[PDB]
Design a protein around this nucleic acid. Structure first.
Ligand SMILES: [Mg+2]
Ligand SMILES: [Zn+2]
Lengths: 21, 83, 237, 344, 63, 316, 577, 226
RNA sequence: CCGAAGCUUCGGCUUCGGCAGGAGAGGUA
């Protein structure tokens, strides 16, 4: 995500993030 | 004893080699002084006349003189005095 | 193709009923293809004969003691299960045992029918020292392997018969091991060592020859699919 | 050795040097995890020998003051509701506030579910106070770890001592002739490869005009054409191989920031340092006794784990007080059989 | 002084030995190791180092 | 002539020549420069170090033929075997969870929702309720897949070509023995794990020497593998020799194999000719030490049994 | 035996190969043989198999903390670039297999070869020289393999039943071979109780006395055994004249058997016996079904109830602190003691739930590896942790590693996991200096004579009596009274003498002394020797490595220093005297 | 009571690559050892054919690139490692591959001589644009097992030659399953079912014949005791 | 001591040619 062309890697995360590294 | 046959470097068994000597420090010198005599006999026989005695027991095909010395010691064919 | 190093088989004899065979130098990995199949074929494919049932009078409802002898039924059964018997007729045969008076009774007092032989006449079965009588009926068949007790629900064909385990196989114990050898410069070749101990009826050298004849025909079905298939040749001896 | 080690080298905080400490004078109290390291230094990634605790790594969200003090962000909470305003705090300002924990249940509106939450008080004290007096909250659960420690799946199930080795040994991997991405990952592997810089990305948007094994030509929308070259079989500082390969077609549309070419330890833009293998957990005849490993022969006949190493040799031709050394094929001392592989 | 100079504080022991004009008899393990001689333990002691071995009379006569 | 060092090989892939006359920067005093690049391809072998992401680490003990390896019910051999005695006592149980999830990701799964979403899958997203073979997933560092989710996914995986499920709900499978043919008596854990190759290879650590270059001040063997050097026999290794009682091994190790210049040649001649090894002389480091001590204005002398200092310099 | 790479043995044995190459008419001069050897021509791979025959080498690993860091083996040529080491010498070398390296050395003269072959051979150095305990013993995988085999499972396949009424006993076998043939068919399990007629195995003492009485001519005398098959196949590995054991092989029992064999038999049968115990251990470890999965790690059934019950008291203590009744110190001391009981209760609840055949239980219950503290940490709760200063934190870690810690629990868990890693490195450099200082002072103590004929000695406690009148064996008697020489005869109640002056104190002498009402004894010690230089053999006593009196010329001052200094890296400080 | 019935063999056809063979009746305990012996023989020592070296024009070593081609020589070799070929001669044979211009190079472009055939004509080799051309020569031999690359300095060949690892095994996957009848009355037998999958170079009923010939010849060194 | 080249009676003789120390950083057991 947030990168134009990237592999689709599904995630188990349950929390959202308000900041980007 | 009731052991199986030893193979390679563990022949003859050392628990019988230590019954002919006073300690484990005299066996080293005993064997290492008989081996030099055997080597001197081998390396002086093809050239001239020597004074040493050849292997008192039958050797193998290509056997080290230390093994022959140990086999002679185990067969009760030698004698030594301590310093 | 050619193997380029033909294996050979050698024999070392330890006893009249024991040996130790060596096969080398086997190609890498071929010491495990041979060992397990050879051991299983030796142990459970050679036919033989053994006692399958007994019938001792005076012991009908309970089996704990028999009046007359110094042993119990279990020890008598164990003594009988160690009998080396060779039989020729395929149908089951029946023999009788009758020894009277004080004194031990051995395996020599069996008077077998014509067609069945006993190879250990000097074996102790029981001792009679209480002015008793012994009368045992034995049934002997032929087969192969180790067949456990066959609990028969005859209910009328027999009332005091006792089924026992049958050891048909003339071979008793087999074990094997695999080691490594060097040929020219390549190490990690193979070497197979087989230890076999048999009964008195057969010799350990004949057992190997009889366990290599039923294995050639077993893999002879696979090579009947195509007569020519470019296998791996071994060359003449 | 690989892109991860290069990225990690540039993010190292060192406690030694001309003005700091010594490997012999330093004791046992300067090598401890202070409660003020939360969000500024990684407590796990550190050397294993005599430099344990004297070298550390910066955390992912940390940043440096104009004075030299490391900051870290927090989310301000008011009236028991978490807001979305980020404030950066230094270690001297966050000890006067109650800071909540990243793993805290938050409803749709933003109110804590649990009546009481685990917080951090003044002197790094852990307490169980209720969700009505806190003043700040963490930004993410991975705020306190570095870039190599955030690449271990199921980290919370591992001890600290083994996770230390796991993070240290990811920087010693070698590049293989073919790469493949993990079946199970963490999501940090995509931005740990773009930021390292061993891939090629597009600086503008356009369509691909020509692709070969060593160049890619991109035509921009305005008219300008840009060409990118590749490093084929280049030697790194440690003798490994650094090879770049294109992963685009001849008619694709490319957006700015898209990865155009792969790299040493990269699979389609994401870092790949190993391979996926089928495992069995069992003892086997004593061949895997005391940390040994048994492999299959399919890993040698199929080039699964194979690497290329390059070496470099030099020589110099100079003058002398008796003449001048010369490089030539003519040598009057050796035979003609060993001078067959030389040119003119 | 040879065994103490190789342990610690070489300068102090060397200075005191030089002033006192000490003499070393070379009768220890460390000194015999340093100068290159047989250590006085194990097979390096007099009883074991001077063993004389010759074949017995009967064995010599037989062969 | 520049020659390839000891124990190296490979093709030649590039040459870079620098000259002085063609306007190239060069150090003063030199005329021509040349660099040669040599490359090789290295496979895996015994002694090479492997690793995982959780702390697993070891060298390769054996490489086995694919017919000697445990195999699944359809004939699939395994690729690597790891021991079970090292996991519980080191508290890294993340590797077993990784193998479980890796098997589920490789095989692919599908959660049934005919009677509504199951109770264990309430918090799963809607795109994680179905997956394709060889799918890639992501479990963040402190917020990832729970254990109810793993336990429930282990019982939803898809079958293979034939309608068989090899790994049951516990993550364990029945394997056959590739050397004897009989099945193993109890189920074994199977899965997929991520293995990396570490830069500690055995081909760069093997070394041996009989004789070679020697030093200049103290005529002992050189040090290092690039210079064909020897191995140190330190102080702690002499105490073991002295505690064993080995008075001749230590003496030979300290004189005719390190410093005895005149005995080094005679030992080689005796070995080649097959005669007896000679008697050790006196080491050179002792003489170097004496000449060092004499330069600090110290009058150190070696006496005899009746005075009359020995010369200790040979020469006659 | 060891395994040596071909390319390393070629370089180590160069002149020995050159002499043989010239001798066998394979070359003309020494230079020709040198060139042929250096070019690795295919003629040099056959002489380097009788050149290296019966020529020992020395293997060394650093640090060398004691004598057994150097040992002599017999080389064998293998394929590869790594050295192969026996599994049973790793305890003496202290070597795992995750990247270690060792060095090789070659003896040259006749004296060096004899010393390596006689004094340093690995099969001669089995007993530890500091305590006399065996070092080359089964461990880890072998212990599990040998503990699975000798275990009796009630209600198994084909076990013995006392059948009566309509059929015989059904489960008596006439030979071990018949039992093996039955087990190859699936009828009988290895771990099922049976009755088998044994012939070539020596019966236990009581059975032998009851049956044969005068003597058991075990070559051909038959008895009856009520045991399993695994126990028979285990006892077929011990020597011929060793009485039947019939017990489950915990590691302590294996150590006891090995020690008895070492003390009552020559040193060659012990070396031949350990090598065949290792084979069976490795064979049966892989067929025991020890494996790790997520389903093998169980959890306590009622963790939440216990944790809530112990949380209520903590909140009560907090309320008392808030009402100004306790200070900070009392509050922390109360919370710590409250939370130190929940860990014990959770540990007991966890222990009461695991079946005894679980893979995680049978690795720690068999003595192979691990504790139960680790098993409680992995599946129960971690408990209390310590801050960087060294004091407990009043808040516990309620989650196991099987459920996963949170961010704060994981962060505060790292305070104490770094202190150990940081002080181990300081301990390693603090112990080497002590060893170097101890070696130098005691470097001139050597056994010089056989007996000084002195009369002094020291007094040894040797057990004390209870008020009732029953003796209590001294807890520390193996390291203070065993292996010593008496100075005066031991008399009792003005009667005869049980042991005489100048006798070693083994276990028979010790029990004979104890079963006669003797506590104080006088032994001969090195502290009171009359010898001018060094010590005498009688005062020193018995050598721990060999089990007999000492040899004139042994260096006993270095063995003591190494034995004291070697266990220096496992001495953790007490967490002010 | 000894069973006189002898084992038989029968083939069931599933696909041009798979088959099933049923052997019965067998002794109670045979079936795992026999199946494992057959599987060990099939997976190791079946003769086939493979490619031992290649040679490209304008290329000296394998660590280089070809102008106009999207893959370097290392990837081209790794792609050619999956070629399935069949040969009948006992001497090396050489094929050819010529291409020019845009398009995609597949294994169907390789022209073999008589006696050699390619069984995988739809595999990807390389891809060229408007400025590239490929010219490769391959050498096909016969053998068995797996042998590594033979260095060209040890065989007297030109600089442009590239040795290549060879895998001669034509068998893919083998497995077996045993169904055991253990009813009472002590009349028991075993049934074996084998599955063989090949690489289209050989039939599933020919690898079995080769293994059978090998095993019949090997087990004949014990029957000579007669 | 090694190499090249001559004499060589086969033991060897003769000509020419040739060297290896410190400091700092990182890492493995
Ligand atoms: Mg280690
Ligand atoms: Zn004394």
């Amino acid at each position: 995500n947030s990168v134009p062309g990237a592999p689709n890697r599904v995630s188990f995360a349950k929390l959202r993030e308000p900041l980007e590294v | 004893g009731g052991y199986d046959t030893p193979l390679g470097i563990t022949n003859p068994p050392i628990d019988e080699l230590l019954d002919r000597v006073s300690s484990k420090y005299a066996l080293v010198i005993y064997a290492a002084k008989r081996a030099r005599q055997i080597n001197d006999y081998y390396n002086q026989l093809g050239e001239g006349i020597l004074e040493y005695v050849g292997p008192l027991v039958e050797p193998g095909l290509q056997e080290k003189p230390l093994s022959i010395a140990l086999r002679e010691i185990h067969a009760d064919l030698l004698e030594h005095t301590e310093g | 193709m050619l193997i380029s190093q033909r294996p050979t088989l050698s024999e070392d004899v330890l006893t009249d009923n024991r040996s130790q065979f060596v096969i080398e130098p086997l190609e890498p990995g071929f010491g495990y293809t041979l060992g397990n199949s050879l051991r299983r074929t030796l142990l459970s494919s050679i036919p033989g004969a053994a006692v399958t049932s007994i019938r001792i009078d005076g012991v009908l409802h309970e089996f704990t003691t028999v009046p007359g002898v110094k042993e119990d039924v279990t020890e008598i059964i164990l003594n009988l299960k160690s009998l080396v018997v060779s039989s020729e007729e395929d149908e089951p045969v029946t023999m009788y045992l009758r020894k009277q008076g004080p004194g031990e009774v051995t395996a020599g007092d069996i008077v077998p029918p014509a067609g069945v032989t006993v190879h250990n006449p000097g074996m102790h079965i029981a001792t009679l020292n209480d002015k008793g009588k012994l009368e045992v009926e034995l049934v002997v068949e032929r087969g192969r392997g180790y067949v456990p007790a066959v609990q028969n629900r005859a209910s009328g064909a027999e009332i005091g018969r006792i089924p026992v385990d049958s050891i048909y196989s003339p071979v008793l114990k087999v074990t094997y091991k695999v080691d490594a050898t060097r040929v020219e410069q390549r190490t990690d070749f193979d070497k197979l060592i087989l230890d076999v101990e048999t009964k008195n009826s057969i010799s350990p050298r004949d057992a190997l020859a009889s366990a290599g004849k039923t294995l050639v025909e077993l893999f002879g079905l696979a090579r009947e699919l195509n007569v020519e298939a470019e296998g791996i040749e071994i060359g003449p001896s | 050795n690989n892109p991860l080690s290069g990225l990690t080298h540039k993010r190292r905080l060192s406690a030694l040097g001309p003005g700091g400490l010594s490997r012999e004078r330093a004791g046992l109290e300067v090598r401890d995890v202070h409660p003020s390291h939360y969000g500024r230094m990684c407590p796990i990634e550190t050397p294993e020998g005599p430099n344990i605790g004297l070298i550390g790594s910066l955390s992912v969200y940390a940043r440096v003051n104009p004075f030299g003090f490391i900051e870290t962000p927090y989310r301000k909470v008011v009236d028991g509701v978490v807001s979305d305003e980020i404030v950066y705090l230094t270690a001297d300002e966050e000890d006067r506030h109650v800071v909540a924990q990243a793993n805290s249940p938050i409803d749709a509106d933003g109110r804590f579910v649990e009546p009481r939450v685990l917080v951090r008080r003044k002197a790094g004290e852990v307490e169980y106070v209720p969700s009505s007096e806190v003043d700040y909250m963490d930004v993410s659960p991975r705020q306190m770890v570095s870039v190599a420690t955030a690449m271990i799946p199921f980290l919370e199930h591992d001890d600290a001592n083994r996770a230390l080795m796991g993070a240290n040994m990811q920087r010693q991997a070698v590049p293989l002739v073919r790469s493949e991405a993990p079946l199970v990952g963490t999501g940090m592997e995509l931005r740990a490869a773009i930021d390292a810089g061993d891939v090629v990305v597009a600086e503008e948007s356009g369509v691909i005009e020509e692709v070969s094994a060593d160049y890619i030509t991109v035509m921009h929308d305005n008219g300008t054409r840009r060409t990118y070259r590749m490093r084929k079989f280049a030697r790194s500082n440690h003798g490994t191989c650094a090879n770049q390969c294109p992963i685009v077609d001849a008619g694709d549309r490319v957006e700015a920031g898209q990865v155009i070419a792969d790299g040493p330890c990269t699979d389609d833009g994401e870092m790949a340092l190993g391979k996926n293998l089928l495992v069995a957990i069992m003892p086997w005849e004593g061949h895997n006794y005391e940390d040994a490993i048994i492999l299959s022969n399919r890993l040698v006949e199929e080039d699964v784990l194979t690497s290329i190493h390059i070496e470099e040799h030099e020589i110099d031709a100079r003058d002398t007080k008796l003449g001048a050394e010369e490089i030539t094929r003519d040598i009057p001392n050796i035979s003609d059989e060993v001078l067959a592989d030389l040119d003119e | 002084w040879l065994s103490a100079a190789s342990f610690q504080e070489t300068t102090r022991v060397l200075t005191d030995a030089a002033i006192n004009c000490r003499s070393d008899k070379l009768n220890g393990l460390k000194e015999n190791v340093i100068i290159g001689k047989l250590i006085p333990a194990g097979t390096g002691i007099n009883r074991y180092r001077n063993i004389a071995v010759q074949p017995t009379e009967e064995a010599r006569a037989a062969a | 002539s520049l020659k390839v060092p000891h124990g190296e090989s490979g093709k030649v892939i590039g040459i870079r020549v620098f000259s002085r006359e063609d306007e190239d920067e060069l150090p003063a005093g030199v005329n021509e420069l040349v660099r040669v690049y040599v490359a090789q391809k290295r496979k895996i072998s015994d002694g090479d170090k492997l690793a995982g992401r959780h702390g697993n680490k070891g060298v390769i003990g054996k490489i086995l033929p694919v017919e000697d390896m445990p195999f699944l019910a359809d004939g699939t051999p395994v690729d690597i075997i790891l021991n079970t005695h090292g996991v519980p006592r080191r508290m890294n149980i993340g590797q077993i969870l990784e193998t479980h999830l890796g098997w589920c990701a490789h095989s692919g799964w599908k959660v049934d929702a005919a009677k509504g979403v199951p109770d264990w899958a309430a918090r799963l997203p809607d795109e994680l309720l179905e997956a394709q073979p060889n799918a890639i997933v992501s479990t963040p560092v402190f917020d990832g897949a729970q254990e109810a989710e793993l336990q429930g996914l282990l019982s939803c995986t898809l079958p293979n070509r034939d309608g068989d499920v090899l790994v049951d709900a516990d993550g364990k499978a029945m394997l056959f023995d590739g050397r004897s043919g009989e099945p193993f008596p109890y189920p074994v854990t199977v899965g997929y794990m991520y293995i990396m190759k570490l830069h500690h290879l055995v081909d760069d650590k093997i070394h041996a020497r009989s004789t070679g270059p020697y030093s200049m001040i103290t005529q002992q063997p050189l040090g290092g593998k690039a210079q064909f050097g020897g191995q140190r026999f330190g102080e702690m290794e002499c105490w073991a020799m002295q505690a064993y009682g080995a008075a001749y091994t230590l003496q030979e190790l300290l004189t005719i194999k390190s410093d005895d210049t005149v005995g080094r040649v005679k030992v080689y001649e005796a070995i080649v000719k097959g005669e007896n090894i000679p008697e050790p002389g006196i080491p050179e480091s002792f003489k170097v030490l004496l000449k060092e001590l004499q330069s600090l204005c110290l009058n150190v002398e070696v006496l005899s049994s009746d005075g009359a200092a020995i010369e200790l310099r040979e020469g006659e | 035996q060891c395994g040596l790479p071909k390319l390393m043995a070629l370089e180590l044995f160069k002149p020995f190969v050159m002499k043989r190459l010239v001798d066998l008419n394979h070359a003309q001069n020494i230079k020709s043989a040198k060139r042929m050897v250096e070019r690795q021509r295919p003629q040099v791979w056959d002489v380097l198999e009788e050149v290296i025959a019966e020529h020992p080498v020395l293997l060394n690993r650093a640090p060398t903390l004691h004598r057994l860091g150097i040992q002599a083996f017999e080389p064998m040529l293998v394929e590869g670039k790594a050295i192969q080491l026996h599994p049973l010498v790793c305890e003496a070398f202290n070597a795992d297999f995750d990247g270690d390296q060792m060095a090789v050395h070659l003896p040259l003269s006749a004296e060096a070869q004899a010393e390596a072959r006689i004094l340093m051979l690995s099969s001669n150095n089995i007993l530890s020289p500091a305590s006399g305990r065996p070092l080359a013993m089964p461990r880890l995988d072998m212990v599990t393999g040998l503990y699975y085999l000798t275990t009796e499972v009630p209600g198994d396949t084909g076990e013995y039943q006392p059948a009566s009424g309509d059929h015989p006993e059904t489960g008596v076998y006439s030979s071990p071979a018949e039992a093996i043939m039955a087990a190859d068919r699936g009828v009988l399990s290895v771990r099922a109780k049976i009755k088998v007629r044994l012939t070539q195995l020596r019966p236990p003492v009581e059975i032998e006395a009851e049956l044969f009485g005068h003597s058991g001519w075990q070559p051909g005398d038959a008895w009856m055994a009520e045991t399993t098959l695994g126990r028979v196949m285990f006892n077929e590995l011990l020597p011929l004249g060793y009485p039947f054991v019939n017990k489950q092989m915990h590691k302590k029992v294996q150590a006891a058997i090995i020690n008895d064999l070492a003390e009552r038999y020559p040193m060659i049968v012990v070396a031949q016996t350990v090598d065949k115990l290792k084979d069976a251990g490795f064979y049966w470890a892989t067929r025991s079904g020890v494996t790790v999965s997520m389903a093998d790690v169980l959890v306590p059934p009622r963790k939440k109830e216990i944790l809530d019950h112990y949380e209520e008291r903590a909140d009560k203590v907090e309320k008392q602190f808030q009402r100004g009744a306790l200070n900070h110190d009392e509050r922390n001391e109360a919370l710590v003691e409250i939370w130190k009981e929940a860990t014990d209760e959770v540990g007991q609840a966890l222990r009461e739930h695991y079946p005894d055949d679980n893979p995680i239980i049978t690795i720690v219950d068999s003595g192979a590896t691990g504790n139960f503290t680790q098993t409680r940490t992995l599946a129960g709760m971690k408990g209390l942790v310590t801050n960087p200063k060294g004091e407990f934190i009043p808040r516990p870690v309620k989650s196991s590693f099987r459920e996963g810690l949170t961010v704060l629990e994981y962060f505060i868990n790292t305070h104490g996991a770094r202190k150990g890693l940081a002080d181990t490195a300081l301990r390693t450099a603090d112990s080497g200096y002590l060893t170097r200082r101890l070696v130098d002072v005691s470097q001139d103590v050597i056994v010089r004579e056989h007996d000084c004929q002195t009369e002094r000695g020291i007094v040894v406690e040797l057990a004390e009596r209870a008020p009732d009148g029953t003796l209590i064996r001294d807890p520390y008697i193996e390291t203070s009274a065993y292996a010593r020489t008496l100075g005066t005869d031991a008399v009792d109640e003005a009667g005869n003498v049980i042991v005489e002056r100048g006798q070693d104190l083994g276990d028979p002498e010790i029990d004979a002394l104890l079963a006669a009402g003797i506590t104080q004894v006088k032994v001969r010690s090195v502290l009171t020797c009359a010898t001018s230089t060094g010590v005498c053999a009688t005062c020193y006593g018995r050598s721990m490595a060999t089990g007999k009196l000492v040899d004139i010329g042994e260096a006993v001052g270095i063995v003591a220093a190494q034995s004291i200094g070697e266990p220096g890296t496992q001495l953790t400080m007490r967490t002010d005297i």
